Structures are given as structure tokens and as C-alpha cells.
Amino acid sequence: VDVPX
Amino acid sequence: VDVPX
Amino acid sequence: PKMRLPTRSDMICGYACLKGTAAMRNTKRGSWYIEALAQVFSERACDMHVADMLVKVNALIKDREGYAPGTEFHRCKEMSEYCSTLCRHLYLFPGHP
Amino acid sequence: KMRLPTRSDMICGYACLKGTAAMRNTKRGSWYIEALAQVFSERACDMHVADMLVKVNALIKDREGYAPGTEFHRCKEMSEYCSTLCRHLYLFPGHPP
Amino acid sequence: LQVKPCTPEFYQTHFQLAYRLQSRPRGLALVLSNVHFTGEKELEFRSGGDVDHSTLVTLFKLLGYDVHVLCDQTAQEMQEKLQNFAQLPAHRVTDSCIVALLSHGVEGAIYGVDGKLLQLQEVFQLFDNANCPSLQNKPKMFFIQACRGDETDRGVDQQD
Amino acid sequence: LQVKPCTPEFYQTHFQLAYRLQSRPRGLALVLSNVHFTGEKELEFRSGGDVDHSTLVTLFKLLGYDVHVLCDQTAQEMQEKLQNFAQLPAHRVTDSCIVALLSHGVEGAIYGVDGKLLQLQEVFQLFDNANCPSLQNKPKMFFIQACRGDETDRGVDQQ
Numbered sequence A, B: 001v002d003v004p005x
Numbered sequence C: 001p002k003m004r005l006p007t008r009s010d011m012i013c014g015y016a017c018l019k020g021t022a023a024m025r026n027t028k029r030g031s032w033y034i035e036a037l038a039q040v041f042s043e044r045a046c047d048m049h050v051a052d053m054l055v056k057v058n059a060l061i062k063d064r065e066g067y068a069p070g071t072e073f074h075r076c077k078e079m080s081e082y083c084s085t086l087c088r089h090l091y092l093f094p095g096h097p
Numbered sequence D: 001k002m003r004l005p006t007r008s009d010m011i012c013g014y015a016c017l018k019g020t021a022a023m024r025n026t027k028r029g030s031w032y033i034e035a036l037a038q039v040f041s042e043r044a045c046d047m048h049v050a051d052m053l054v055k056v057n058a059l060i061k062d063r064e065g066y067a068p069g070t071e072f073h074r075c076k077e078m079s080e081y082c083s084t085l086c087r088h089l090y091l092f093p094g095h096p097p
Numbered sequence E: 001l002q003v004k005p006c007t008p009e010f011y012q013t014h015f016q017l018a019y020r021l022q023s024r025p026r027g028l029a030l031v032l033s034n035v036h037f038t039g040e041k042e043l044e045f046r047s048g049g050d051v052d053h054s055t056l057v058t059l060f061k062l063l064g065y066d067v068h069v070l071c072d073q074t075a076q077e078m079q080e081k082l083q084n085f086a087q088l089p090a091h092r093v094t095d096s097c098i099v100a101l102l103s104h105g106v107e108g109a110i111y112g113v114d115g116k117l118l119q120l121q122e123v124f125q126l127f128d129n130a131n132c133p134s135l136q137n138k139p140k141m142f143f144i145q146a147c148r149g150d151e152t153d154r155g156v157d158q159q160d
Numbered sequence F: 001l002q003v004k005p006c007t008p009e010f011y012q013t014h015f016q017l018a019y020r021l022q023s024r025p026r027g028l029a030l031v032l033s034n035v036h037f038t039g040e041k042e043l044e045f046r047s048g049g050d051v052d053h054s055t056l057v058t059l060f061k062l063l064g065y066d067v068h069v070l071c072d073q074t075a076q077e078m079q080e081k082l083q084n085f086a087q088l089p090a091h092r093v094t095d096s097c098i099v100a101l102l103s104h105g106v107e108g109a110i111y112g113v114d115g116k117l118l119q120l121q122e123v124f125q126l127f128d129n130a131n132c133p134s135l136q137n138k139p140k141m142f143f144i145q146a147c148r149g150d151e152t153d154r155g156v157d158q159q
Helices: C032-044 C050-063 D031-043 D049-062 E008-014 E049-062 E075-086 E120-126 F008-017 F049-062 F075-086 F120-126
Strands: A002-004 B002-004 C011-015 C024-026 C081-084 D010-014 D023-025 D080-083 E027-033 E065-071 E096-102 E109-111 E117-119 E140-145 F027-033 F065-071 F096-102 F109-111 F117-119 F140-145
Touching: C011 C050, C024 C032, C032 C050, C032 F049, C032 F140, C050 C081, C050 D049, C050 D080, C081 D049, D010 D049, D023 D031, D031 D049, D031 E049, D031 E140, D049 D080, E027 E049, E027 E075, E049 E065, E049 E096, E065 E075, E075 E096, E075 E117, E075 E120, E117 E120, E120 E140, F027 F049, F027 F075, F049 F065, F049 F096, F065 F075, F075 F096, F075 F117, F075 F120, F117 F120, F120 F140
Parallel strands: C011 F140, D010 E140, E027 E065, E027 E096, E096 E140, F027 F065, F027 F096, F096 F140
Antiparallel strands: A002 C024, B002 D023, C011 C081, C081 D080, D010 D080, E109 E117, F109 F117
16 A cells, blocks of 8 residues: 555 | 856 | 866756655555666666656656555655756666676 | 646756855856757757756856956856656757748 | 757657647747846846846747746736736647746745745646646746855865 | 666767766665654654665666665764765765665655654755765765655646
């Protein structure tokens, strides 16, 4: 899944 | 002559 | 009187995201930007200059979108950029001679 | 159906760097605009805008202040550009006729 | 000032890798020069700004643009007329856009003739994909002749 | 990962208009990854940063760089060691430099594992013509994997 950096 | 901008 | 230099020059800086925005990262594959960067550089360092490769990385990031079902980040976007004070083409010339 | 990042496909040329001043000749105009017209007018035919801005950087890097008895005498400047472009920007001047 | 034409051979070997850039005009160009300042904050009249303005108007005309011009505008005037410009319907039938802003400035902002600041992020946003659907996927060029600081770069000697 | 080498012909027809870049190694490279944030301001663990770090180290070795690595560093540790790296004597005999910084961050600064910030201007400054004379005229590349904000880009529909 894609998460904020 | 050259001057600041 | 010899030729002198600005205080800062001959730099190129690649950013994973734009001012005021977030960069996206996949928890298994890693960051979108780094992944894209590795793909382009490894494939094209041989015949493309770094600034152009980074335009190529821009294209990959523009077409990507988030996979985060049930969350606010599903289908979210990111855009990369680079800033350059380079004064010549930057070819990395891998593996030459 | 695919979506766009909020902002993309921009290139912005700056006469100077963050925190730094830009220099303007009282008779010849700004160093940067002067450099830009020269390069674009000569090279639009065979060079993309991003590469042209690199050449503008080269001219600016080497230029220095003429203003004897000021601190601006022998002063320097560095332009830069930031790009969210995703391909080559050729202006193709004069094609087709 | 003369713009050398590109050859057909160059076009045929480069058009497929580049942004589409064949419309007539190539796009709309806006040259916005502030030279004479009149606000409470004093800012030195930008001598030679006139040559900058001619140079860019000529250059962009020669590059095939429809050149719009604005001189000596206030921060509010600048914001409003940049917005009108970005919203012009002509952008639908062109392939690119050019904005040149020439003035005094500070980091991330340029002055109008009244000594008030217009933030550059706010200007770029006028032309973004959200706000300027007409220019979606089209190349948008910005050129900013303005200071980003008041410190002279005395420069540095070349080592050895 | 595999890096296609350039052909001699490509080198011969391109070297004259490019930065001198033939030193062995091509340059020093530094990959600085913060992943675990053990600090005051709670910053989510950068899952997948391990793959970022591995990919660059590999990438830069294969591009012919001498790769230095730092992991999970405080703001102050990043600053000191970036300065130590910028001042290394190898830079005189190399032709370029690479610094990749991977962490959480804000506009214009990045986070150490302590939740404190290092300003990016201070970093670029360490490699400039006044402070890093040995890299004068040489191309210096920076890659910054870090957020510059908190708001999601929701994206826009293509008309």
C-alpha cells in the first residue's frame, strides 16, 4: 500500500 | 553599470 | 584578473515532490521516485544526460497513482521536479572505456 | 480513467538563486534576459528549452559586475531553472513554413 | 535579434519525443514588466527594464507567439490580469504558454509598482491542471527576472 | 539492476559538450537513509525505505561511484557528517559528486531521527564554491526523497 513521505 | 534587481 | 565563480553553481537537485506536497511510498516496493530513478538511470545513463533522465522520471511519476483502498490516499498523485544550476550536459558515461 | 497531478508540465527559469540577487545593466538590460534572448534566438532551431536554459546558466556563471567603486564591481550571479516537464520542449521555430 | 529556423529533418527526427508544438500561434505569451515604483516602500527605478521588455516581446513574436503586454502593474492588477490571461479561451487551440515577469522581488514573490508582494506559488497555480484545464498536458514556460535577496555575491576565486 | 554501458562512439561524440566525467571512481556518493523515527514529533516508520536504500547503493556502485552510507541519523549528526563528507580529500581527484537524502521532511528541510530539522540550504551550501573548493566546476547531484508538506494531492480529472 502507498503511504505519505 | 550593473545594479541589483 | 582571472575568471571567478558564483558562490554556488554546477548543481542539480531532484525532488520526489513539489513545494508544499507529499511524496508517496509503497511499503513493499519503496518510494515512487527512487524506483523510477533507478529504472531510468540504469536503463539510460549510457545515452542520456542526467537532466533529461530526470525529465523521464517526471513522466513516470505523473502517470502513477496511489493504491490505498479504504484510505484517503487511494488514487492520490505526486509530482517530481528538479532544479539545475548545471552549465553543461551531464553524461555519466557508465562503463567507459 | 487516469488523473493528473495538480501541477505538471511547467518549466520556470529564474534570473537568480534562492537568497541571491539578480544583476541588471543600466544600458544592456538584465544579464539573464540578455543571455536568454541570445541563446533562444540562436539555438531554438536545434536545442530543447531545458538544454537552452543550461547554456544560459553557462553565460551567467561567467559574467561579472562592472561598477567600479561599488561592492557590485566584480560581483556574480547564478541563474537556475526548475522543471516539471515530462518530455523535450522543442519550440520548432519556423516549421512548417 | 533573429531566430534561425529549424530544418524539416530536425522536426521529423524530434517531434515524437517532444511535446506537441505546432499550433499557430505556438501559444499566447505574456510579458509583464514593472520598472517604475511608487509605493511607501521605495524601490529603485529599474533602468534597462525597457530593453528587457523589447527584447522579450521581439523574441516571443519571432518564436511564433501572440504576445500580450503589461507595464507597471500593482500586485492586485498583476494577480487579476494573470488570472484573466490564464483563463483566456484561446489557450484551447494553442500548444504551449509563456509567462515572463520582470520586476523587483524577494524570495518567492515579486513586487507590483505599489511595493506589495505577489507570491509566485499563487501565480503558478493560476496555470495548473486544476485551474487551467485548457493547458492540461501542454508545456508552460515561466521566466522570472527578479531578485530573491539583497545580498551581493562577491563571488569566489577559482581554487588553484 | 543492470547498467547498460555507453559505447565508445557515444563518448567520443558527446564528451566535448559535457562535464569532464571519466575519473575512476566517477565520484564519491553518499546515501543517507532515515527510516526509524525514535523522537519527539511522532513520524511514521518509513516502511520500504530499506528497498530505497539498497537500490541507490547498488545503482551508484554500478554507475561507478564510491558509495558511503549513513542510516538513522539525528539532525546534528546529518549536518556534521555531511560536512565531513564534503571535506573529504578524494573530491579533488574525482570528477563529480552524488548526495541522496531519504527521510521525512517539510518544505526546505529534512528530519533527523530525533524529529529535529536540517535546512536544505545548509546542505547545498556545504558543497558550494566557497566551502567545497575541491568540487569547483564539477557537477554535484542531489536527490531528496522526503515530503515537503502534509496535504494529499487528490489529483485532477483530465478534461
